């Protein structure tokens, strides 16, 4: 589903069809590279979407003093500080899962159990 | 009488309040129509048959609300197929033979995947929407689909005709996405059930609190709505109380304003006497139509130049 | 008296561990889901419901010790003035201050106001309103109470001028 | 006789794919022309659902999930039968079924709506029925000089009422 | 409450409450005159319980009824024991003389 | 099956809706023909398996003795239900040449779908005969049997001079009803008739109320 680009020339590479070989050849409309696809897949709407919860970790998340604290262990390390909060993606319909990073293990893990 | 009738009506409208539009804005509405609604909400009565059959409810709501190939589009792919009679997906090859058993098509496939779920909460099989969408070309689209019971409904289309493929494809992708309907009338949205209960006259002769199926929308229409079977024609109500007018006549619809303010005026504050309201909802309407009383509506008539 | 103040006391504080039930059943991602609305608004119904039935039961139980020769008991039975409402919400506790029925809104980043830690849902944290008038209030409280009335005053002075319009 | 003629040889190559092999090819073949006379008993080629249920049929059986309806349509389940059964949702196999089953429960509580409860007491009494079963909610409407209204309504019949 | 049946059995009046009311027992004048006034009443019934779905028995209307015959009892001081010297023909030609001498719009054609 | 059941249905409760109309119009028709039973329809009105023919039963009707007895003058009405989708100017000008030939005054006309103005033009033509359209679906369902709409009446002209002598009006003042109702074409009326109207009023029960069709 990326978009690549020419190697000789960074520029978005379109799909066009072999008239005879019956073979995509992303061919560039800059140069004249051209390179055959992997897969027929070309394009994709996903007009349903639910993905958002969990990114934005940086490395040192515990570093900020507003975030709250809890003493569940990761399972993994088995010590007993943690960071934990909720999800950030924010929809009118998105859950109270929460997420729980720890220290020492340096792991994301969750409390949900279905 | 009609001046002590203004007064009455228009001291209780200090204290009021600010879902369902209600409150002020609500009431500036209705006495100001504004052809528009803001809620196109209408109420639908059953048939008296059927008492308290929860599958017809939902048979029944299935039947109203309008829903789009949107409501049950989840995966829609595009895929270049070369041979037009043998599958390059591993997939979908036996589907081949189940429709094998109308050559010169471009070797493009468009694929779309629903929602088992999605599909049969509104009972319909994928048997007869990949036979409509067949029916709304027959001439341009070759259209194929697997059973029901696999675990992954799929559309095969392509376009067949005796290079500019892609934009063309995706186009009429957006096309068939955003026109086709499939069942219901639409300007009518999602419906759900309340367990209303009705006084109802005892069979030996006394009143019961008796419980019953009710019908409620976020969608409007009259023309339509009456049609469909297994409905009560009769009991049906709409708080936008114009179309009630239009479709029904304009008894029926100061009646329906009537109810419309009453409901309004007694949600707080109750009560005023009945005379006052009826004077001015029927001196509201009796010219034959709906008049509000704006700069220019009911001013614009054959009247005192000096009111 | 002093023990139908621990009384209240302890009713309000099994108030608060349901809550805190039902949030670790919320938090654990298994809940009912409830028919109509969405996920967050029955957890909101949920709470809503709760702290009233925690408020109206205090001041029924209030109300009922209260003596037969206490005068504002015989001013509000005898009628003119105040009610049941009134002296419980003087007397026992306040309830959840809100705006437009949703209770005090996210304003800054991931929290309600930026003095209580990250990401929370409790009674405290929203501020659901814990004292009586008597005992005092945190500033918490008498924010929140100040917001409330805030909005009273505004919707009224813009419906004056509409509701004026519309009479004449 | 081109559709007699085209199904008669799908369930040819139906039955003849099967790992239950065909030596008694004759009963099969008999098998074959009582599933395609009745089959034609709906329509005669003279509908144009002849060919729909002849789809439901011929992909439940190629459809494995289950291969095992092969088995029993070959050791009885006879084809008179299955015209008039319809019972495509009912069969191949029982797994996907309580996953319909699953699927129909959702959709039927998700389709049931808004139920605020309204909460009651025994402290006023109605106008209507006079009963003490008050729907009380409580709230502010006017202006500065007031404390709350005291709404009121009557959950045992629906009166709703204020006090002063 | 209201079926009264002056040859019958089960719904008779007591005489006790009439003086002319034990040999009047099985009158068939009196019976006719019984008879199509609960006729009168019952068509009434199915008349408002058409005109209303539900069944509310509270509505607004002029003068009052309970309370202006509760101060005609309480003034001219009725006893709880002595037979009335009511007939039935006065109470029934009566409540007509009212019915029609209500009068609300002075005309006399046939519309008014 | 597919919506064929249901075209039936809909045509069927569409004669029904009809035919109470001609009724309580004021037209001779035994009140049990309007519960003609589905199935009986069906049977009487296909031709082999599915199909309706809708151009023959089409009927005539008569005016009550009580008709007469009011008013001295209608001739028979006479309904009809086109095949064709739209109304072909040709065919409708047989069916009113039909109706002149057969002396008809009421022009009682079913359209399946929409009506070209090029025969909408001479619709208003041969006075005194007059020609009303109605659709199918918006005659699915009698409008009159709907709770919310009070019963309607006619009056005659005599009983409308009647009223205004009585009342000292003056023909203007009182209140009025637009020609293009559906109550006012339901009842078919014309400019300057008068209509009584009875609701179930809720100080006194039976009401009167008068309309001016204008
Ligand atoms: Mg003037
Ligand atoms: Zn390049
Ligand atoms: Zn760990
Ligand atoms: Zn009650």
Redesign the pocket.
């Known amino acids: 589903t990326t978009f690549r680009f020419c190697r000789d020339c960074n520029n978005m590479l379109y799909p066009r069809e072999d008239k005879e070989n019956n073979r995509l050849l992303f061919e560039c409309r800059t140069c004249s590279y051209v390179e055959e696809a992997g897969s027929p897949l070309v394009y994709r709407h996903e007009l349903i979407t639910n993905i958002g919860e969990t990114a934005g970790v940086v490395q040192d998340i515990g570093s900020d003093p507003t975030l709250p604290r809890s003493d569940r262990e990761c399972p993994k390390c088995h010590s007993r500080e943690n960071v934990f909060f909720q999800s950030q993606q924010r929809r009118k319909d998105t859950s109270m899962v929460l997420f729980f990073v720890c220290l020492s293990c340096s792991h994301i893990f969750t409390s949900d159990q279905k | 009488v009609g001046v002590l009738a203004a007064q009455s009506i228009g001291e209780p409208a200090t204290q009021m309040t600010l879902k369902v539009t209600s409150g002020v804005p609500r009431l500036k509405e209705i006495l100001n129509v504004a052809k528009n609604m803001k809620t196109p909400s209408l109420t639908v009565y059953l048939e008296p048959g059927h008492a308290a059959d929860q599958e017809q409810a939902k048979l029944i709501r299935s039947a109203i609300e309008h829903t789009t190939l949107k409501s049950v589009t989840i995966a829609s792919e595009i895929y270049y197929d070369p041979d037009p009679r043998s599958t390059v997906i591993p997939e979908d090859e036996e589907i081949i033979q189940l429709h094998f058993s109308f050559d010169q098509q471009s070797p493009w496939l468009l694929r779309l995947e629903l929602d088992r779920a999605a599909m049969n909460d509104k009972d319909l099989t994928m048997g007869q929407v990949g036979e409509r969408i067949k029916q709304t070309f027959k001439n341009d689209l070759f259209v194929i689909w697997s059973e029901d019971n696999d675990e992954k409904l799929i559309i095969r289309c392509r376009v067949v005709r005796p290079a500019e493929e892609d934009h063309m494809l995706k186009k009429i992708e957006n096309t068939m996405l955003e026109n086709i309907t499939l069942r219901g009338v639409e300007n009518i949205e999602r419906v759900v059930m309340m367990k209303y209960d009705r006084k109802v006259p005892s069979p030996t002769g006394e009143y019961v609190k008796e419980p019953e199926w009710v019908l409620e929308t976020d969608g409007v229409n009259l023309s339509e709505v009456m049609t469909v079977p297994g409905i009560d024609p009769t009991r049906i109500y709409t708080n936008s109380f114009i179309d009630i007018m239009e479709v029904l006549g304009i008894e029926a619809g100061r009646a329906a304003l009537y109810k419309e303010v009453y409901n309004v005026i007694a949600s707080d504050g109750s009560y005023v006497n009945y005379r006052h309201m009826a004077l001015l909802v029927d001196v509201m309407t009796t010219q034959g139509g709906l008049t509000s009383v704006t700069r220019h509506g009911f001013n614009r008539s054959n009247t005192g130049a000096l009111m | 008296d002093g023990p139908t103040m621990r009384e209240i006391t302890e009713t309000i504080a099994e108030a608060k561990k349901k809550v805190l039930d039902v949030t670790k059943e919320a938090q654990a991602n298994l809940l009912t889901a409830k028919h109509g609305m969405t996920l967050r608004e029955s957890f909101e119904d949920n709470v809503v419901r709760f702290l009233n039935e925690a408020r109206d039961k205090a001041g029924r139980l209030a109300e009922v010790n209260l003596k037969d020769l206490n005068n504002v008991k015989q001013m509000v039975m005898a009628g003119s003035k105040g009610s049941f409402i009134n002296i419980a919400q003087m007397s026992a506790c306040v309830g959840q201050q809100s705006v437009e029925g949703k209770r005090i809104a996210f304003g800054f980043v991931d929290r309600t106001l930026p003095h209580f830690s990250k990401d929370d849902y409790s009674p405290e944290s929203k501020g659901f309103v814990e004292n009586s008038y008597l005992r005092g209030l945190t500033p918490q409280e008498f924010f929140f109470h100040a917001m409330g009335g805030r909005e009273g005053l505004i919707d009224t002075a813009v419906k004056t001028a509409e509701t004026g319009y519309i009479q004449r | 006789h081109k559709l007699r003629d085209q199904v008669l040889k799908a369930l040819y190559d139906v039955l003849a794919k099967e790992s239950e092999h065909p030596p008694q090819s004759i009963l099969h073949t008999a098998k074959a022309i009582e599933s395609e006379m009745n089959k034609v008993n709906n329509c005669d080629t003279n509908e144009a659902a002849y060919k729909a249920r002849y789809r439901i049929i011929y992909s439940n059986v190629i459809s494995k999930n289950n291969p095992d309806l092969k088995h029993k349509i070959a050791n009885g389940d006879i084809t008179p039968e299955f015209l008039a059964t319809c019972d495509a949702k009912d069969l191949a196999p029982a797994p996907l079924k309580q996953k319909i089953e699953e699927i129909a429960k959702q959709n039927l509580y998700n389709a049931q709506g808004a139920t605020i409860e309204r909460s009651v007491t025994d402290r006023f009494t109605?106008?209507?029925?006079?009963?003490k079963?008050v729907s009380y909610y409580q709230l502010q409407t006017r202006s500065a000089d007031e404390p709350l209204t005291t709404f009121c309504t009557?959950?045992?019949?629906?009166?709703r009422w204020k006090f002063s | 409450r209201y079926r009264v049946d002056l040859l019958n059995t089960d719904h008779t009046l007591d005489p006790s409450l009439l003086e002319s009311g034990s040999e009047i027992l099985g009158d068939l004048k009196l019976q006719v005159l019984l008879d199509e006034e609960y006729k009168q009443l019952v068509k009434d019934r199915k008349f408002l319980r058409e005109v209303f779905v539900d069944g509310e028995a509270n509505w607004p209307l002029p003068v009052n009824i309970r309370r202006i015959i509760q101060n005609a009892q309480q003034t001219f001081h009725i006893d709880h024991t002595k037979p009335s010297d009511l007939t039935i023909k006065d109470i029934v030609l009566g409540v007509k003389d009212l019915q029609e001498n209500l009068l609300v719009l002075r005309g006399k054609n046939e519309i008014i | 099956d597919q919506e064929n059941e249901r075209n039936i249905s809909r045509l069927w409760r569409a004669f029904r809706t009809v035919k109470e109309m001609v009724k309580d119009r004021g037209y001779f028709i035994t009140q049990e023909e309007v519960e003609l039973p589905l199935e009986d329809f069906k049977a009487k009105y296909c031709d082999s398996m599915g199909r309706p023919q809708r151009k023959m039963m089409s009927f005539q009707a008569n005016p009550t003795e009580e008709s007469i007895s009011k008013f001295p003058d209608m001739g028979s009405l006479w309904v009809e239900f086109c095949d064709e989708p739209s109304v072909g100017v040709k065919t409708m000008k047989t069916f009113v040449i039909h109706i002149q030939e057969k002396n008809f005054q009421t022009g009682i006309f079913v359209y399946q779908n929409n009506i070209t103005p090029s025969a909408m033009k001479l619709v208003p033509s041969i006075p005194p005969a007059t020609i009303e359209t109605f659709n199918e679906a918006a005659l699915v369902v009698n409008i009159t049997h709907h709770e919310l709409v009070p019963k309607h009446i006619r009056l005659s002209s005599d009983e409308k001079r009647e009223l205004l002598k009585r009342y000292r009006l003056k023909e203007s003042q009182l209140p009025r009803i637009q020609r293009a109702d559906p109550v006012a074409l339901y009842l078919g009326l014309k400019r300057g008739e008068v209509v009584k109207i009875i609701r179930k009023s809720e100080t006194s029960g039976r009401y009167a109320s008068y309309r001016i069709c204008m």
């Open positions: 109605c106008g209507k029925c006079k009963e079963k009557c959950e045992a019949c629906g009166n």
